[PDB]
Structure 1
Amino acid sequence: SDRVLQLKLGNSAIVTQEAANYCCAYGEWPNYLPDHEAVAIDKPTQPETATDRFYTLKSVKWETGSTGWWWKLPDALNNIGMFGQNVQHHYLYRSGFLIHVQCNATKFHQGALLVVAIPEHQRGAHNTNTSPGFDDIMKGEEGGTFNHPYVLDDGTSLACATIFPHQWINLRTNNSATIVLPWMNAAPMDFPLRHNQWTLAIIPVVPLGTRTTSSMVPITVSIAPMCCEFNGLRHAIT
């Protein structure tokens, strides 16, 4: 009963037959900005179903040497569909996200993915005094790969990452993970091109294994922005 889930948002739907409940980060749900928390006084555009829909990113191959993958929000979506166009035309943005992570394999496969949403995942570089550059951080839709997932690329640890909102994909048990993220920021809105509220991370704590004939085992990421608001209409930065 908590293994089958349908998510419907706008013109998009996802069904899964092997979920493991789903996470609402910190027990929150996305909502629009109330008047008692507003700063910017222009009337916001609320595009609803034009933006509040699943976008599916390029799938990555899970391979025996894989260190894990990450995608930054809103950056990974800033160039996609009508969400991206509103990002490019507006100074200010606010939304939640619905994250659905997909990975199926046979009953003869084994492997476990930690699927974790990290708020303000400020990265470190390895073995240098120089801070990470713009091109190290801003990957867009492709996302990045972990250099040292064991310290989360930030001198910290993977083992304690379960303090952040997460599920697991354990190929024995489930083929999908779902995390619902509220707006997570100190300011009520932000400029979407220079700050990321959330990093999705997928780390293979138990590596992919089988003795059947090998197949490509992709991991697929689908993300729906939720309750998108935009303020400060301008030309496109683009």
Structure 2
Amino acid sequence: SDRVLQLKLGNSAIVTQEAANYCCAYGEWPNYLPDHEAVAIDKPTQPETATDRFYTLKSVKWETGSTGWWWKLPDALNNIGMFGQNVQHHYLYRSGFLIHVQCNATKFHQGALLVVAIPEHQRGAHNTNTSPGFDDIMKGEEGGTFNHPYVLDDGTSLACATIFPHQWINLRTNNSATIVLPWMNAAPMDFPLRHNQWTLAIIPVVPLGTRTTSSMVPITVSIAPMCCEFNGLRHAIT
């Protein structure tokens, strides 16, 4: 009853038979911007199924020495499908996200992945006074990897990352994690090309292990924007 789940958005659907539950960040659900909170006065465009659908990013391989992976939103989706086109043609965007992380192995495999959505994951640089550059932060669809997951690449602690909305993929228990993210920002809308509201981090707290014949064990991320709206139409910028 809580291990099987189907998510359907637009023309996309996902089914998992080894879920635990799914997390609604801070007990909230995505919604459109209400009139009593709006700032931009132009009529927003709400593409609905054109943008509110699952986009699957490139899979990554879970290796023995893997330190972890991250993707910044909306940066990771800014060049994908109609969501990317709307982002490129509009000065302002707003949306939640539905995140589904997939990783399966055998009953002889072991490992634990922490799947956490970090709001405003401002990254720090290691052993230097220079702030991270644009190329260090904006990785797009490919995402990045943690240099020091122990401190979340920001001088904090991985052990306390559970304060953020998160699930675990414990191979003996489940093969997928689902997190629903509301709009998380100090402003009602934002410029999607210069600010990232959420960071999805997947960190192998317990390394992948087995004594059976080894196989590639990928981790796959599917993200569906929810309640997308865009304001300030102009020419494409990207």
Q: Is TM-score (shorter-chain normalized) higher than 0.5?
A: yes
Following superposition, the deviation at residue 190 of structure 1 comes to 0.1
Q: What's the secondary structure of 2:116's corresponding residue?
A: strand
Deviations 1:27-53 (A, max 9, x none): 000000000000000000000000000
* Whole-angstrom distance in 2 between the partners of 1:224 and 1:20: 20
What root-mean-square deviation, in Å, do the aligned CA atoms of Structure 1 and Structure 2 show?
Answer: 0.2
Following superposition, the deviation at residue 62 of structure 1 comes to 0.1
Q: What's the secondary structure of 2:199's corresponding residue?
A: strand
Following superposition, the deviation at residue 129 of structure 1 comes to 0.1
Following superposition, the deviation at residue 116 of structure 1 comes to 0.2
Following superposition, the deviation at residue 156 of structure 1 comes to 0.2
For residues 72-221 of structure 1, what are the structure 2 equivalents within 5 Å? Answer: 72-221=72-221
* Whole-angstrom distance in 2 between the partners of 1:224 and 1:10: 9
Following superposition, the deviation at residue 126 of structure 1 comes to 0.1
Q: What's the secondary structure of 1:97's corresponding residue?
A: strand
Following superposition, the deviation at residue 215 of structure 1 comes to 0.2
Following superposition, the deviation at residue 54 of structure 1 comes to 0.2
* Whole-angstrom distance in 1 between the partners of 2:112 and 2:76: 24
Structure 2: runs of 5 or more not aligned: none
* Whole-angstrom distance in 1 between the partners of 2:20 and 2:225: 22
The percent of aligned pairs where both chains have the same amino acid is 100
TM value normalised by structure 2? 1.00
Following superposition, the deviation at residue 13 of structure 1 comes to 0.2
Following superposition, the deviation at residue 87 of structure 1 comes to 0.2
Deviations 1:88-113 (A, max 9, x none): 00000000000000000000000000
* Whole-angstrom distance in 1 between the partners of 2:153 and 2:197: 17
Following superposition, the deviation at residue 237 of structure 1 comes to 0.2
Deviations 1:184-232 (A, max 9, x none): 0000000000000000000000000000000000000000000000000
* Whole-angstrom distance in 2 between the partners of 1:189 and 1:200: 20
The aligned residue for residue 65 of structure 2 is 65
* Whole-angstrom distance in 2 between the partners of 1:160 and 1:119: 14
Following superposition, the deviation at residue 136 of structure 1 comes to 0.1
Deviations 1:119-144 (A, max 9, x none): 00000000000000000000000000
* Whole-angstrom distance in 1 between the partners of 2:29 and 2:124: 30
* Whole-angstrom distance in 1 between the partners of 2:62 and 2:80: 24
Following superposition, the deviation at residue 153 of structure 1 comes to 0.1
Q: What's the secondary structure of 1:86's corresponding residue?
A: helix
* Whole-angstrom distance in 1 between the partners of 2:20 and 2:36: 37
Following superposition, the deviation at residue 19 of structure 1 comes to 0.2
Q: What's the secondary structure of 1:15's corresponding residue?
A: strand
* Whole-angstrom distance in 1 between the partners of 2:181 and 2:152: 20
Q: What's the secondary structure of 1:58's corresponding residue?
A: coil
* Whole-angstrom distance in 2 between the partners of 1:205 and 1:34: 40
Following superposition, the deviation at residue 56 of structure 1 comes to 0.0
What is the number of residues matched between the two proteins?
238
Structure 1: runs of 5 or more not aligned: none
* Whole-angstrom distance in 1 between the partners of 2:102 and 2:80: 20
TM value normalised by structure 1? 1.00
Q: What's the secondary structure of 1:118's corresponding residue?
A: strand
Q: What's the secondary structure of 1:82's corresponding residue?
A: helix
* Whole-angstrom distance in 1 between the partners of 2:225 and 2:126: 32
* Whole-angstrom distance in 2 between the partners of 1:157 and 1:236: 40
